[PDB]
Design a protein around this ligand. Structure first.
Ligand SMILES: [Cl-]
Ligand SMILES: [Cl-]
Ligand SMILES: [Mg+2]
Ligand SMILES: [Mg+2]
Ligand SMILES: [Mg+2]
Ligand SMILES: [Mg+2]
Ligand SMILES: [Mg+2]
Ligand SMILES: [Mg+2]
Ligand SMILES: [Mg+2]
Ligand code: NA
Ligand code: NA
Ligand code: NA
Ligand code: NA
Ligand code: NA
Ligand SMILES: [Sr+2]
Ligand SMILES: [Sr+2]
Ligand SMILES: [Sr+2]
Ligand SMILES: [Sr+2]
Ligand SMILES: [Sr+2]
Ligand SMILES: [Sr+2]
Ligand SMILES: [Sr+2]
Lengths: 160, 140, 186, 154, 95
RNA sequence: UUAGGCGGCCACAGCGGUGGGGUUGCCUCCCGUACCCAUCCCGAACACGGAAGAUAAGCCCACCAGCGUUCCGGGGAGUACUGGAGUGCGCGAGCCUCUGGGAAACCCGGUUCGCCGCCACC
RNA sequence: AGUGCAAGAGCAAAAGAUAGCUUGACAGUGUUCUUCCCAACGAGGAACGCUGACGCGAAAGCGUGGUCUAGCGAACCAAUU
RNA sequence: CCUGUCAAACUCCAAACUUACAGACGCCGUUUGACGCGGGGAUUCCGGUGCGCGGGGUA
């Protein structure tokens, strides 16, 4: 199913699980990667991937971008590299699909997505001055798998 | 200051938690006054589905009736620190409960302008063990 | 107390001094209230009316100011209560008040009690108050007879401060006799 | 005292906005009225803010417009100093202009129509699709801006 | 609306703000009003009886007499004149 | 109000805490069951009768802000949102400008440990 | 928590519980609102009165069924008082 | 304790705004009689578009 079908916020917030059944499971494997036993404060560099347009990101897309991002951080810093990345959004919005013409059209439940306002941080990483470009590269790959354009903004980092 | 702070016995409640009574007779003798039936609440698997119905009996003693009972009741127990409340109450054993408190306890038992007894005026386990122990027996 | 959503009772409720449900039913009469109260030593009768910023007491009597007319006896008994009601009642009539509803606050409707004696007193003073005779103590008890016979079981005077030995309900009579009399400085 | 001039027609404008203009005595495009600066009138002009041009005019400008467009409550009698003097509580137009600006009287009080029926702006105006701050002609103007408009429509 | 009973869609207007929960003060349930007086109509969530139709919440009517202990208040629903029977508990003087 | 009664508003009044106060005065705790009355058993309570003792409770007075609440300053914020207008921008979801309104969270500093009415009373 | 049953709402010296008593789940007749916003329309419903007769309570007062909003039916005809 | 997120059928908060009544200003009415009232005659009960706010639907 094309994202063009769900990327816009053109429907009421649909999240009440007490009134919705049959909601598919999320495909997002982890929201906290790297060394999560360590605190983000222990790093000199903090880089975030910022969304430039308000949109909806289906859990399938989050998993893909997060995966292709962290996967790179693993390949370049190791299965235990000194870094930590976070996917701060969760897909609360339940999605439908009308899958019988336009009669009784209310769709059946088919998935979930996270609403992201433009300017917000979707992902945020924390690394050492060394692996600053490795995380910038992980993000370049991640924003290629989500609808909107993104800004790779560097927070704590005056080592230019 | 001490006269209106030195403990006393508000009530001694003797009771037999049976479960279906005929035992009223003995309590009426070991205490000196009429006993009261005990009803239960909530249905119970153990053939106890009848909500309201005799299951026990108790007798609340006050003043002399209470002391004249303890004089011959306390010697029948091996009181211990643990066997005491956080309010200064203790119950041993047929159950035998002793409610100890400071003078003006009425302030919380009257109808008009009643009030909760301040924690300072609330009896203490230590303060309780003392009073009692300070009268015909030992502690722990 | 616990949080923003916590519900604190109205002040007179926490203080456990006003039964609001009974109060409402009381006020529905549209008539003034004969507020009957009592302390360990005294008894107080007040004729209260409803007001914009709170109640308005129009007349009242305290068992203490009973002496002011010739009372040397204790002030926390039946004779005391009746006479106090009557005095308050008489003063009520003075201020133009003619009818009332008995408000016994948090006291119990026990037959023959003092709040009921206060009521009988206020009624005899000429005040129209809905009541029931068979809930009022018999005359003699109001006079204080029950106490005399209690002093009969003497061996040791009932009253410490000597007001008398065998006590006197006849004094009650002298006082009521004085109050029902016109003269009297209310 | 502000001078109000309708610059945008009635077609498609909110009815409550159209009734406001009429209450302010304006029933046509290019018609101008003078309104005291009260809280009540303030709300009214604020509501018609997008279909009008307003501001405080200078004494001279008010005098030019009055001379050229003031009218009697009835009739075609020309309005000049002699008319003013022989009909109002003032000696001439200036006395009227001053009293108006100082909000001491109203055109009606002095037997004059509440409305000045101005002429189209000589050389056109700055457009009715944008406010003053954006280069348009709508909304509140400078005393100099208002005078420019009122004079081009004398 | 899915249904059309009197309390349809009255969740908010008939619910008490948490702190105003519980039996209401008797003073306003005994308040007396005079004919001609302007009174705002507002149902008191805690008071069951003496209410008017929720649809009228927010009206400012005119007392024109009483029926028993309740008041007869005149209002104009849209363009229609109606008489509302309502007890003091659900009324408040204007100004 | 050197301690009381009936209240209005119903936490600015709650929660917790510190200090002070009573010989024939007040309120209490308190003493006590012949009576009225009372406990499905208990003068515990309710009710009645009363003053040996006490200010330890309560209560009243003075006060503390840690929690809760009210209001206020400064910051967040004229932000978020928004009534009116536009041949302004954007592929578009949408955004911007002018005009008129305008938060919430939260932080910091203050305020708040009730206010008021009637009656009675060294 | 409980309050018969949806949901939302109401309720703590109670609208909940227990005990005891009681039959107002009463007869007659209205006002008003609702049904049907505005704005006419029936049955049905509710709130609030007057009259009669009662219950309970010391009394104020409460009781026109169940805390509130669902549980309902024209004319003709029959039976019934 | 710290740290990451939400709600058409959540709310300790809370607009713009809509709305009842009143006063003031404006406008209008007392020969153009308004407001209100009674009566005669209808037509009408396929609507559409823009804008704002929507709900359904990939549209
Ligand atoms: Cl009392
Ligand atoms: Cl109604
Ligand atoms: Mg002309
Ligand atoms: Mg142009
Ligand atoms: Mg709503
Ligand atoms: Mg002390
Ligand atoms: Mg375009
Ligand atoms: Mg047929
Ligand atoms: Mg039949
Ligand atoms: Na079909
Ligand atoms: Na039993
Ligand atoms: Na309430
Ligand atoms: Na004390
Ligand atoms: Na009907
Ligand atoms: Sr849509
Ligand atoms: Sr992209
Ligand atoms: Sr005792
Ligand atoms: Sr496109
Ligand atoms: Sr402002
Ligand atoms: Sr009912
Ligand atoms: Sr609306």
């Amino acid at each position: 199913k094309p994202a063009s079908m769900y990327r816009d916020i053109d429907k009421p917030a649909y999240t009440r699980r007490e009134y919705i059944t049959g909601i598919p499971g999320s495909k997002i494997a982890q929201h906290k990667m790297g060394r999560k036993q360590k605190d983000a404060d222990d790093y000199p560099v903090q880089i975030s991937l910022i969304v430039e347009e308000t949109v909806q990101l289906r859990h399938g897309s989050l998993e893909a971008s997060r995966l292709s991002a962290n996967r790179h951080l693993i390949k370049e810093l190791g299965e235990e590299g000194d870094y930590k990345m976070t996917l701060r959004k969760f897909p609360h919005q339940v999605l439908r699909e009308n899958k019988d013409g336009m009669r009784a059209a209310f769709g059946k439940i088919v998935g979930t997505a996270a609403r992201v306002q433009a300017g917000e941080q979707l992902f945020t990483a924390y690394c050492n001055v060394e692996d600053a470009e490795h995380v910038k590269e992980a993000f370049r790959r991640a924003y290629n798998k989500i609808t909107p354009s993104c800004r790779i903004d560097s927070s704590p980092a005056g080592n230019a | 200051f001490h006269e209106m702070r030195e403990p006393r016995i508000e009530k001694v409640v003797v009771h037999m938690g049976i479960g279906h009574a005929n035992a009223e007779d003995i309590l009426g003798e070991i205490t000196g006054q009429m006993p009261v039936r005990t009803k239960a609440k909530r249905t119970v698997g153990e053939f106890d589905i009848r909500e309201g119905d005799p299951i026990g009996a108790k007798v609340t003693l006050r003043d002399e009736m209470a002391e004249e009972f303890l004089q011959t009741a306390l010697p029948l127990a091996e009181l211990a620190t643990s066997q005491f409340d956080d309010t200064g109450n203790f119950s041993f054993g047929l159950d035998v409960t002793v409610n100890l408190v400071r003078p003006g306890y009425r302030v919380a038992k009257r109808d008009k302008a009643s009030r909760s007894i301040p924690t300072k005026h609330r009896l203490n386990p230590a303060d309780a063990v003392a009073f009692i122990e300070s009268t015909y027996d030992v502690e722990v | 107390a616990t949080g923003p959503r916590y519900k604190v009772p109205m002040r007179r409720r926490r203080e456990a001094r006003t039964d609001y449900h009974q109060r409402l039913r009381l006020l529905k009469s549209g008539k003034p209230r004969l507020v009957a109260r009592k302390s360990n030593k005294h008894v107080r009768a007040q004729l209260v009316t409803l007001g914009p910023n709170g109640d308005d007491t129009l007349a009242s009597a305290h068992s203490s100011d009973l002496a002011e007319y010739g009372w040397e006896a204790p002030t926390g008994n039946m004779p005391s209560a009746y006479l106090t009601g009557l005095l308050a009642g008489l003063r009520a009539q003075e201020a133009g008040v003619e009818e009332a509803v008995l408000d016994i606050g948090l006291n119990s409707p026990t037959p023959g009690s003092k709040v009921f004696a206060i009521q009988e007193g206020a009624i005899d003073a000429g005040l129209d108050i809905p009541h029931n005779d068979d809930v009022l103590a018999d005359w003699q008890r109001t006079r204080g007879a029950h106490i005399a016979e209690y002093d009969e079981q003497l061996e040791e005077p009932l009253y410490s401060g000597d007001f008398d030995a065998a006590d006197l309900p006849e004094h009650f009579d002298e006082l009521r006799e004085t109050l029902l009399d016109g003269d009297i400085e209310l | 005292m502000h001078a109000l001039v309708q610059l945008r027609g009635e077609v498609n404008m909110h009815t409550d906005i159209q009734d406001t203009l009429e209450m302010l005595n304006i029933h046509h495009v290019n018609h101008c009225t003078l309104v005291p600066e009260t809280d009540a009138y303030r709300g009214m002009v604020a509501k018609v803010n997008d279909f009008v041009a307003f501001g405080e005019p200078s004494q001279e400008t008010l005098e030019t417009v009055l001379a050229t467009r003031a009218e009697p409550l009835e009739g075609d009698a020309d309005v000049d100093d002699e008319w003013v003097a022989e009909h109002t509580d003032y000696d001439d137009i200036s006395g009227l202009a001053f009293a108006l600006l100082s909000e001491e009287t109203t055109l009606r009080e002095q037997g004059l129509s509440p409305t000045l029926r101005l002429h189209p702006p000589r050389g056109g105006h700055d457009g009715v699709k944008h406010p003053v701050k954006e280069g348009g002609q709508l909304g509140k103007h400078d005393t100099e801006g208002i005078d420019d408009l009122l004079e081009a429509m004398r | 609306p899915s249904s059309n009973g009197p309390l349809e869609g009255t969740r908010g207007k008939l619910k008490n703000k948490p702190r105003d929960r519980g039996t209401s003060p008797p003073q306003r349930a005994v308040e007396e009003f005079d004919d001609g007086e302007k009174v705002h109509l507002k149902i008191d969530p805690s008071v069951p009886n003496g209410r008017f139709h929720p649809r009228f919440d927010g009206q400012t009517g005119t007392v024109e007499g009483k029926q028993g202990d309740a008041y007869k208040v005149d209002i104009v629903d849209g363009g229609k004149e109606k008489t509302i029977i309502v007890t003091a508990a659900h009324l408040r003087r204007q100004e």
